[PDB]
């Protein structure tokens, strides 16, 4: 149902790959463990901070 934002599935969630990062628990859980993950306590390294704005052709395209 249309309760979420528009999300691309194409047909497969990891075609000869993986969905996100299927790996063993590093130090503990992620939920309710350390606040500010967005920007209030922005971590040194974990994501791709490659640009601040304009994701190519308004969603993805390069």
């Amino acid at each position: 149902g249309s309760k979420r934002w528009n999300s691309c599935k194409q047909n497969k969630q990891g075609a000869n790959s993986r969905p996100v990062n299927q790996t063993p628990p590093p130090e503990g859980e992620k939920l309710h463990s350390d606040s500010g993950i967005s920007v209030d306590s922005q971590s040194l390294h974990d994501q791709q901070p490659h640009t601040q704005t304009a994701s190519g052709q308004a969603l993805k395209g390069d």
């Binding site: 691309c8 497969k12 969905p19 992620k30 791709q48 490659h50 993805k60």
Partner: protein, 61 residues
């Protein structure tokens, strides 16, 4: 915007799992589908557009 064998859209196909394998999965299985958490939470008060590229740019990090 591509049309060839094994296209870049086949990595970006992960976008449906990239968010839903937290908010509909940490309730059903332990924290193992995503060792990181910044990739999904980017959608909130940081960068609601970088997230859609990460599913191709760096699936794991």
């Amino acid at each position: 915007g591509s049309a060839e064998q094994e296209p870049t859209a086949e990595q970006l196909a992960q976008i449906a799992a990239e968010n839903e394998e937290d908010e509909h999965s940490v309730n059903y299985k332990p924290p193992a589908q995503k060792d990181i958490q910044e990739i999904q939470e980017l959608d909130k008060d940081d960068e609601s557009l970088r997230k859609y590229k990460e599913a191709l740019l760096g699936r794991v990090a």
